[PDB]
Design an enzyme around this catalytic site. Structure first.
Site, PDB file in Angstrom:
ATOM      1  CG  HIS A   1      -0.389   0.424   2.483  1.00 57.56           C
ATOM      2  ND1 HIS A   1       0.008  -0.484   3.442  1.00 57.56           N
ATOM      3  CD2 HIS A   1      -0.137   1.650   2.999  1.00 57.56           C
ATOM      4  CE1 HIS A   1       0.477   0.167   4.492  1.00 57.56           C
ATOM      5  NE2 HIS A   1       0.400   1.462   4.249  1.00 57.56           N
TER       6      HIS A   1
ATOM      7  CG  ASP B   1       0.202  -3.895   3.099  1.00 60.83           C
ATOM      8  OD1 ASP B   1       0.650  -3.471   2.006  1.00 60.83           O
ATOM      9  OD2 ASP B   1      -0.097  -3.153   4.067  1.00 60.83           O
TER      10      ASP B   1
ATOM     11  N   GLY C   1       3.232   6.548   8.445  1.00 61.52           N
ATOM     12  CA  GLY C   1       4.586   6.908   8.068  1.00 61.52           C
ATOM     13  C   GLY C   1       5.576   5.813   8.425  1.00 61.52           C
TER      14      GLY C   1
ATOM     15  CB  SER D   1       3.036   2.044   6.341  1.00 67.17           C
ATOM     16  OG  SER D   1       1.906   2.276   7.157  1.00 67.17           O
ATOM     17  N   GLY D   2       5.381  -0.158   5.993  1.00 72.07           N
ATOM     18  CA  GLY D   2       6.411  -0.700   5.131  1.00 72.07           C
ATOM     19  C   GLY D   2       7.697  -0.953   5.884  1.00 72.07           C
TER      20      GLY D   2
END
Ligand SMILES: [Ca+2]
Length: 240
Positions: free
Chosen positions: A45, A93, A186, A188-189
């Site tokens: 995402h 994800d 922020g 995320s990932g």
């Protein structure tokens, strides 16, 4: 990261900053993990929009120049085939980014170690989340890399009605939930580093938090379980 502390410049060398071009400047949007000199693992995402991305390694302060950064472009984006933008709760994800050029490894840039496929952590295992995400719900990004102790919450407990219930799948990892510490927009990932046999390995890719807030009791940060995608990751890096 809510309720965290600033990390040492060389504590988490595999952490990267994924930024998109905003006009004539670059803006941090997600975290990620360097798994190869030219491959980065992050959240699907995070790269759903058709923007121009760049990866920064050896980064510590997003606003200043540390004198240890290396800026490289993103040549190719490989999103998991089953990812669905409209259903993050469906899982999958995760994305791989082939960098335009191989980076140079040193004290500030190292590869993250991935766990063996199928590896599941016991409840309350010691892990840390790192990132430049918001330091408060509806707050602002951090300037320097933050870290926070975030122990795991097993599937059995995390999928119970008192927590996330059915929203959480076995292909995910839950951590935190004490109402004080957690990931936030922020982060995320980014990675979830967990101590296993004297070594820190990346067991999760930050995926989502509650719509009602970042640090919400009984609503731990949810991560993509990396050990469930080892085969996929290997097939991609070997083919592409
Ligand atoms: Ca910097």
């Amino acid at each position: 990261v809510v309720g965290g502390t600033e990390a040492q410049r060389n504590s988490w060398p595999s952490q990267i900053s994924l930024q998109y071009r905003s006009g004539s400047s670059w803006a941090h949007t997600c975290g990620g993990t360097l798994i190869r000199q030219n491959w980065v693992m992050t959240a699907a995402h995070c790269v759903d929009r058709e923007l121009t991305f760049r990866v920064v390694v050896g980064e510590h302060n997003l606003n200043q120049n540390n004198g240890t950064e290396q800026y490289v472009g993103v040549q190719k984006i490989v999103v998991h085939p089953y990812w669905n933008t409209d259903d993050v709760a469906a899982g999958y994800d995760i994305a791989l980014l082939r960098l335009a050029q191989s980076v140079t490894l040193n004290s500030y840039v190292q590869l993250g170690v991935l766990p063996r496929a199928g590896t599941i952590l016991a409840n309350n295992s010691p892990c840390y989340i790192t990132g430049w995400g918001l330091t408060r719900t509806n707050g602002q990004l951090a300037q320097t890399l933050q870290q926070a102790y975030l122990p795991t919450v097993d599937y059995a407990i995390c999928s119970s009605s008192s927590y996330w219930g059915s929203t959480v799948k076995n292909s995910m990892v839950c951590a935190g939930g004490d109402g004080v510490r957690s990931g936030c927009q922020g982060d995320s990932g980014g990675p979830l580093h967990c101590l296993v046999n004297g070594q820190y390995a990346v067991h999760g890719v930050t995926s989502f938090v509650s719509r009602l807030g970042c640090n919400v009791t009984r609503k731990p940060t949810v991560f993509t379980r990396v050990s469930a995608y080892i085969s996929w990751i290997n097939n991609v890096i070997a083919s592409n």
